[PDB]
Amino acid sequence: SSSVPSQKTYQGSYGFRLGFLHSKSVTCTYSPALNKMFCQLAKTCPVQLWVDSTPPPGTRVRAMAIYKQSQHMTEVVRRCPHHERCSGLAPPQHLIRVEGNLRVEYLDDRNTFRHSVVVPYEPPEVGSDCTTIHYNYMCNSSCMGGMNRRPILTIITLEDSSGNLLGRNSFEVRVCACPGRDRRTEEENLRKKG
Amino acid sequence: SSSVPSQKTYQGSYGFRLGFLHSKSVTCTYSPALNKMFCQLAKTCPVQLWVDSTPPPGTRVRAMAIYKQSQHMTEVVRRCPHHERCSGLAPPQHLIRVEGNLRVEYLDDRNTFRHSVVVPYEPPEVGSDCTTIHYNYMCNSSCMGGMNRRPILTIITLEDSSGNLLGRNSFEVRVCACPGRDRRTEEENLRKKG
DNA sequence: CGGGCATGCCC
DNA sequence: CGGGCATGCCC
């Protein structure tokens, strides 16, 4: 009955976890202490999928944004009117895109109105321990009429072809002009005032 | 042949001049030194019309915004996509509105695509030396996808019913959250660095 | 590139 | 209300 998707971590029977590459001026950088990705708008944000056990054929990987703060959780995260107007398969209203994938699907939920982007799950290549997806966030966190400075979480779910939830993980995202500066600022704030 | 309207002051045979009331946190304030109005979005910005001689019946008062800097003069000044979407008679794309007037006309030029807003000229009441029009600016100067931090001029023209230009005056506008702060900052910059 | 201005807003 | 943070950007 809820229109707010769960953000509860569920690593599940397949041992599903997210991973991030190690990285002022940088195009993205991930803070383990904050569980937070800092990245630039319309630029590659790699996310690694790690599993202990192999998902069944036909498993799908869904990404969805939700506002982090309780006061905004019920509002659908959308692209701002400016970036919606300056717009391949991604509807211009969608914040999150996937690049480099020929089987991407963009979904608008008939009941909750929430946007999500889905690609097939593929196991890592021989010798690799993870699968990397290239996400793109098409607005800054600050965009007026869109996220409007409100932090979001990205929720990544592993789902089988039948719709069973196999795993769920989430990370906070700040899309900003200066990821390196802002990560250092927030980590210092955590140490000094958190 | 030009699509850029003239901004040249032409006080003309009727002795046409603009006037402004004397005024942090203030909703508007005019700087004589800068010939610049500082005002808040969607709030009253009174402009006084002064003439030495009485215009003929059917005279009209037109207001139009142009970008002040040479690099942007040829671009039409428009409302940003966010404020256009969150919108009486004024088309949502128009930056400048007039409130309190039952004969307001909003014009989109067929050839130059520029927006303007027009009201009839009315002489001052007995004992008064000027006529006041209440303008509203529907975006901040900073609005992304609109003025985008670029200064504008407002051009006020007195035109007879036949289309003759009787007078022209202009003033710079900064639409901003804190007119009093920003006026003091710019006037200090003028004294120290201008 | 990094230093520092910008400017709506602080929940 | 004013002090000062915010955060894309400096032409």
Ligand SMILES: *C[C@@H]1C(=O)C2CCN1CC2
């Ligand atoms: C955004 C990511 C990173 O974390 C670094 C810098 C750019 N990409 C790949 C490596």
Ligand SMILES: *C[C@@H]1C(=O)C2CCN1CC2
């Ligand atoms: C998660 C794995 C690794 O450890 C490296 C970088 C990303 N994938 C493939 C090789």
Ligand SMILES: *C[C@@H]1C(=O)C2CCN1CC2
């Ligand atoms: C915006 C104008 C002014 O200059 C002062 C303050 C509010 N209005 C009327 C007087």
Ligand SMILES: *C[C@@H]1C(=O)C2CCN1CC2
């Ligand atoms: C321009 C005139 C004045 O001097 C005062 C204020 C505005 N109008 C009417 C009275």
Ligand SMILES: *C[C@H]1C(=O)C2CCN1CC2
């Ligand atoms: C973040 C900051 C930088 O380091 C360069 C890119 C964006 N911004 C301006 C220059």
Ligand SMILES: *C[C@H]1C(=O)C2CCN1CC2
């Ligand atoms: C300009 C500044 C003020 O003085 C109040 C109104 C807008 N802004 C925040 C509070």
Ligand SMILES: [Zn+2]
């Ligand atoms: Zn945006």
Ligand SMILES: [Zn+2]
């Ligand atoms: Zn606007």
